[PDB]
Design a protein around this ligand. Structure first.
Ligand SMILES: Cc1cc2nc3c(=O)[nH]c(=O)nc-3n(C[C@H](O)[C@H](O)[C@H](O)COP(=O)(O)O)c2cc1C
Ligand SMILES: Cc1cc2nc3c(=O)[nH]c(=O)nc-3n(C[C@H](O)[C@H](O)[C@H](O)COP(=O)(O)O)c2cc1C
Ligand SMILES: O=C1CCC=C1CO
Ligand SMILES: O=C1CCC=C1CO
Ligand SMILES: [Mg+2]
Ligand SMILES: [Mg+2]
Lengths: 399, 399
């Protein structure tokens, strides 16, 4: 059924429907599909779903000129820890990704692979089973007691990365990005947000290191910028984006409670602009808004009102993708896209509306999403959400 | 005469005329007199003008409940270098300051002493004459070639402060603040803005040190926060404010050209909020707007459009005084004071309008200022600017 109390507003008369170039891609509108983990990848081997993934991405690429960022993809087994998320390290995986990229391109849309490393958000028992470390920035602070428990139970205690193991990750990032481009992706997005490994280095709560990767703003940012630099070198700045969530508390990050948090993220932004003036401007910076500090809370919950992402705009002068509770708030989007370098990521509603761009353009009702099938091993709640046309035929307007 | 093309707007219906408590002072409106150097202090001894200073401050205290921040005052001879700016280190000086504070208090207004240390903006020849160092953060970078010349000529080359000399300044800040309070001031403002000594430590262009006072965001901020801490300890957090100019280029600071500049200032703001949650919240943070990057350029010139001070609001949760080209833009002030903790500093127009608050309240014409007498040794352009009543009597409406 449709979202019951929603008062849609057509956005076709706004900059949301003005074309923009991001990296090498000529977007025809600025509604972006942000990275959305769906847990349909098959085990063993973290293989993109051979039955459903192509169709899923095809449906969502249906509006020509759409920028799609994939679900997080592990760069290596050690970077993983969820059996049903995809990876981009093996030939098996890339064969399925190539089919996906081809289908999106045939719909005249674009695809960026999000490169994902879990750190302490990984399941230590899964890792222990596969002979892998349970990794984070530090070893004296844990995500929650449960995760700290599972580690000890699985005899896989949280391990503070040595400098050589960090380098190994950087090498894996490099190879995963090369794999992505070679298989046909338009670019990659470095996931440095939402409390995953890179974020665990950025945040002073999770990073209590005293070597050059912790103890200061510059140090905590080091790992992230090294990945950025390694990837810009490997496949070019025009094929690299960065995702950040300055106010996020997901996976036990500090958010606005940390008084130094804006300074931490402002520094990263500064360093990106620095590289941009020196000839190497990233394709985009992708920001999670304080509008959503946890995307598994219903829209309007977990909103942080004490901080704004606007600071990034004073520092980084390139494209900015903003994501978080925008689908139900076209009145907000209308204002934000008045800025000419701002794009809008729509997450949960792109899950449930394959034709979302049309619906935004024309102010059509939205399909409700089903949180129960966000992470299910099923076609249901994945590829069976109807377009508006199909929804009408199913009588959804009269439910 | 009156400002010719100005279209005044009454502001009495805005928060500019709502009372607010700053430190121990109950302000009755939020139009603040920012620090304004006028060079009427007498030489020798940097003594507040015995003929004119009381009358000057009296005229400008005339609206009850007005917060006045004094012209910059040197904390020590070594901190000085302009013969006609006042100091707050000697008994001679404090006797004149006491008369000033008394007169302001009799008008039911308030007075905060700005504590000033010149660093490389000082005249090295004046200092050499008095046997004093020409001080800055570093010795391999100079304000301009002229100042670098005068130093060498006066055999007083720019001197990079040792850690002991920095401590000596901190001691002088402490004593100057104690002197101010003892003489009757409501508080002090630490001048960490506009390219003076503390700013020279904050800015990566002027600070090329490799010890703990330079080389990183935290290090460059060290001197400023030490002063803050020493003064909060000495006279209380409710009697201490801080002035900053994140986008300023005055006296050869970097401004927005430096990609790390927001991060530098965000860190300072964070540290202040940190102390604020730990029980020691400064009375206010005072910000120079990118609206004015140089107050000796006419209004509208030297405006930086690539950056905003709004970031401070996501980090510091206390009162914020904002200054820069607000007098001729009531349409801007109307919006900014909708924030309930925002005050507006009016500089050049408080120079030329002793009754400025009334004129803002009622939307009256403004007296033009005379830049030629900003720094003159004269009553003219100091205490002879007319109130609106006097201006009418002089026929200023018919000029
Ligand atoms: C089911 C689900 C899976 C997600 N997976 C990812 C992910 O893999 N990588 C990522 O950076 N963000 C992920 N997110 C966060 C979203 O990209 C987005 O920031 C969030 O949903 C807020 O946007 P929205 O209000 O439009 O849904 C996910 C969110 C949801 C609800
Ligand atoms: C003549 C003059 C003297 C000033 N003296 C000081 C000073 O001693 N300390 C300080 O922090 N700012 C000083 N300033 C900067 C002002 O406080 C203020 O930030 C600036 O004038 C911008 O505000 P406005 O546009 O309202 O004039 C001075 C400005 C002028 C024009
Ligand atoms: O970032 C991710 C990956 C899976 C869920 C989230 C939350 O945003
Ligand atoms: O800061 C000061 C002191 C004298 C002039 C300025 C410019 O703002
Ligand atoms: Mg029907
Ligand atoms: Mg008349």
């Amino acid at each position: 059924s449709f979202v019951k109390d929603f008062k849609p507003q057509a956005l076709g008369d706004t900059n949301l429907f003005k074309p923009i170039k991001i990296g090498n891609n000529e977007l025809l509108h600025r509604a972006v599909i942000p990275p959305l983990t769906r847990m349909r990848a098959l085990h063993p081997g973290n293989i993109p779903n051979r039955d459903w993934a192509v169709e899923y991405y095809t449906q969502r690429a249906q509006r020509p000129g759409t920028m799609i960022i994939t679900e997080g993809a592990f760069i290596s087994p050690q970077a993983g820890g969820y059996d049903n998320a995809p990876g981009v390290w093996s030939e098996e995986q890339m064969v399925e990704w190539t089919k996906i990229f081809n289908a999106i391109h045939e719909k005249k849309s674009f695809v960026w692979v999000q490169l994902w490393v879990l750190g302490w958000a990984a399941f230590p028992d899964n890792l222990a089973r596969d002979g892998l470390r349970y990794d984070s920035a530090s070893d004296n602070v844990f995500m929650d007691a449960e995760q700290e428990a599972k580690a000890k139970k699985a005899n896989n205690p949280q391990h503070s990365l040595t400098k050589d193991e960090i380098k190994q990750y950087i090498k894996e990032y490099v190879q995963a990005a090369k794999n992505s481009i070679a298989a046909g992706a338009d670019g990659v997005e470095i996931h440095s947000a939402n409390g995953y490994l890179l974020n665990q280095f950025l945040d002073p709560h999770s990073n209590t290191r005293t070597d050059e990767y912790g103890g200061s703003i510059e140090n905590r940012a080091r790992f992230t910028l090294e990945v950025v630099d390694a990837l810009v070198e490997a496949i070019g700045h025009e094929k690299v984006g960065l995702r950040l969530s300055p106010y996020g508390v997901f996976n036990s990050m500090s958010g606005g409670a940390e008084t130094g948090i804006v300074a931490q993220y402002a520094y990263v932004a500064g360093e990106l602009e620095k590289r941009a003036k020196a000839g190497k401007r990233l394709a985009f910076v992708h920001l999670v808004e304080p509008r959503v500090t946890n995307p598994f809370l219903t829209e309007g919950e977990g909103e942080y009102e004490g901080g704004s992402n606007d600071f990034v705009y004073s520092i980084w002068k390139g494209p900015v993708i903003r994501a978080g509770n925008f689908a139900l708030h076209p009145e907000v989007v209308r204002e934000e896209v008045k800025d000419k370098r701002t794009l809008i990521g729509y997450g949960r509603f792109f899950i449930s509306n394959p034709d979302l761009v049309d619906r935004l353009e024309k102010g059509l009702p939205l399909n409700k999403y089903d949180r129960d099938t966000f992470y299910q091993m099923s076609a249901h709640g994945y590829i069976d959400y109807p377009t508006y046309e199909e929804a009408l035929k199913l009588g959804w307007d009269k439910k």
